[PDB]
A paper describes a structure:
Interleukin (IL-), an IL-6 family cytokine, has pivotal roles in autoimmune diseases, fibrotic complications, and solid cancers. [name] activates downstream signalling pathways by binding its two cell surface receptors: the [name] specific receptor, IL-11Rα, and the signal-transducing receptor, glycoprotein (gp)13013,26. Following the formation of the receptor complex, the Janus kinase (JAK)/signal transducer and activator of stat (STAT) and extracellular signal regulated kinase (ERK)/mitogen-activated protein kinase (MAPK) pathways are primarily activated. [name] and IL-6 utilise a homodimer of gp13026,34,35 while other IL-6 family members exploit a heterodimer of gp130 with a second signal-transducing receptor, such as LIF receptor (LIFR), OSM receptor (OSMR), IL-27R/WSX-1 or IL-12 receptor β−2 subunit (IL-12Rβ2).
We solved crystal structures of [name]Δ10/Mutein and [name]Δ10/[name] at resolutions of 1.8 Å and 1.5 Å, respectively, to understand the structural consequences of the mutations. SAXS experiments show that the crystal structures are representative of the solution structure, and SV-AUC indicates that both proteins are monomeric in solution. The structure of [name]Δ10/[name] is similar to the structure of [name]Δ10 (RMSD 0.3 Å relative to [name]Δ1049), indicating that the [name] mutation does not alter the structure. Thus, the 58PAIDY62 mutations alter the position of the AB-loop, shifting the register of key loop-core interactions by three residues, while maintaining the composition of the interacting residues. This register change is due to a shift of the LX(S/T)LP motif that mediates loop-core contacts: In [name]Δ10 and [name]Δ10/[name] the motif is 51LDSLP55, while in [name]Δ10/Mutein the interacting motif is 54LPTLP58. Surprisingly, stimulation with either [name]Δ10/[name] or [name]Δ10/PAIDY resulted in robust STAT3 activation, albeit with a higher EC50 than [name]Δ10, of 610 ± 120 pM (p = 0.04 vs [name]Δ10) and 140 ± 12 pM (p = 0.01 vs [name]Δ10), respectively. However, a small population of hexameric complex at ~7.5 S was observed in the sedimentation coefficient distributions, indicating that the [name] mutation alone permits some hexamer formation and consistent with the ability of [name]Δ10/[name] to stimulate STAT3 activation in vitro. In contrast, neither [name]Δ10/[name] or [name]Δ10/PAIDY inhibited [name]Δ10 mediated STAT3 activation, contradicting previous reports that the [name] mutation alone is an effective [name] signalling inhibitor.
Author numbering: 10 to 178
The structure:
Amino acid sequence: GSPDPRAELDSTVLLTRSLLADTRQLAAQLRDKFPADGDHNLDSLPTLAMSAGALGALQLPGVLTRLRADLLSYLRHVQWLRRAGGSSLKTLEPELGTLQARLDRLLRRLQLLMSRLALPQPPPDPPAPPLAPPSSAAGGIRAAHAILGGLHLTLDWAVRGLLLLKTRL
Ligand SMILES: [Cl-]
């Protein structure tokens, strides 16, 4: 019948926590093999909003729209890593492929949530051009740290924001 927004957000948050745990684990595996000297970023990754606090029903559609777009970008980046990241990342498979599959399951769940709740859905933003290959083997590893770290942070803020928003429903 009519969906219970609170229960739908609870379910979505549970699946997001799962993906967050898979991402944290792969990031630790990557750092064990290729230690990193400080935080790493990529220009082609979305900007983290870290939007928590003053989160009410009014913000829910926007939070979900933004998370969908961010996760799609992260998916493209994971796919690129597996494709052109370089031989150095071969042992991160099959874990990176499994992460990609679970990221797809979360995207489907978000689309289902927005449809069931009759929430306005975004206009198709033009797909970004292809990602260039890494400039070097070390550049590919830095990119992997940036992609996994950024995905971790995106999912952490999604959990936090969606649970704070749920408290006002
Ligand atoms: Cl799903």
